[PDB]
Amino acid sequence: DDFAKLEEQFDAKLGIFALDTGTNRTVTYRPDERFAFASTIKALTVGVLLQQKSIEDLNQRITYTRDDLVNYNPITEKHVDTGMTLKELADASLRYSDNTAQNLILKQIGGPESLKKELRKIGDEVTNPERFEPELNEVNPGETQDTSTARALATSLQAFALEDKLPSEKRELLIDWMKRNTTGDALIRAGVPEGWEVADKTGAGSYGTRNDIAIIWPPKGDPVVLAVLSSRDKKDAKYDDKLIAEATKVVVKAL
Ligand SMILES: *C(=O)C1=CN[C@@H](C(=O)O)C(C)(C)S1
Ligand SMILES: [Cl-]
Questions:
Q1: Residues having C-beta closer than 5 Å to ion ligand 2
Q2: Active-site residue flag, 135
Q3: What does the alpha-carbon distance between residue 203 and residue 201 come to, in Å, rounded to a whole number?
Q4: Domains of the chain: residue spans and CATH
Q5: How far apart are CA 56 and CA 179, in angstroms?
Q6: Which residue ranges have their beta carbon within 6 Å of ligand 1?
Q7: Cα 125 to Cα 229: distance, rounded to the nearest angstrom
C-alpha cells in the first residue's frame, strides 16, 4: 500500500479523505483518525463568518492594538494604527495564515464555542474547536481538543465551498481567497497535474502536524474535495511538506 509506504518513508501518520463529487468515488486512509487541525480551522471559520455577515458587513473596520497581536501576524502587525476591514482580515487569515486575523474573526462569530455550535448545525459532529491561535496548534496525544478528522474537515469544507450552506456569491468569495493562498505551494498544489486548479488552506502544529485541505478542479468536470492530515511521534518533530505532495499524487492516481 502506497500510503503505508509514505508513512514509513516520512515516519509520520497520515489521514486522507478525498471525494470526487461527480462520481462519489473516494480515496481514504485513516479517514476517521483525529489530528490537530491547526490553521486549517481558519477556512471553516471564514465559512461561518460568511453565513452570518453580508458583503457590506465585511467592509466594517475592525480596530485592534499591539496587545491583540499574537505570534504570527504578517499582515495584521502592519495595520495596528489604521485597523483592517473584516474582508481584509479574512484575506489575511486565509492567504497568509495570519493568527491575529483568525482571532479577530473568531470573536466576530462568538468564539470557539460558537464556531463549534455552527459546525454541529451543518452536520459536523467531529471538529472540536476550543482555543484561539496559536494555542490551538498544540495538541497532545489522545486529546480531542482542537482536533478533527480528514473526513470531517473535507466534508465541512465541501459544505461551505460547494453546497448550499453559503449562497453562490459567498461560495465564490471563499473559493477565490483559497485559490490565492500563499502558503501551500509545496503541499496539495505540488501533487496535482498541470491544469488543475487548487483552493487550499494549510496548517502546522505540535508533534510535527502538517495539514492541507482543499477543493481541486481537474481541467474538465466536477471538483474533488481533499483533506491530507499528518502528525509524528515526537512533540518537537519537524515536518516535511513532500509527504503531503506525495500523498496527493497517490490520491490523484487512485481517482
Ligand atoms: C497554522 O497552522 C499556523 C499558523 N501560523 C504560524 C504559527 O506560528 O502559529 C504557523 C507556523 C504557520 S502554524
Ligand atoms: Cl498555516
A1: 39, 97, 202
A2: yes
A3: 7
A4: 1-255 (3.40.710.10)
A5: 22
A6: 38-39, 71-72, 97, 99, 133-134, 137, 203-204
A7: 18
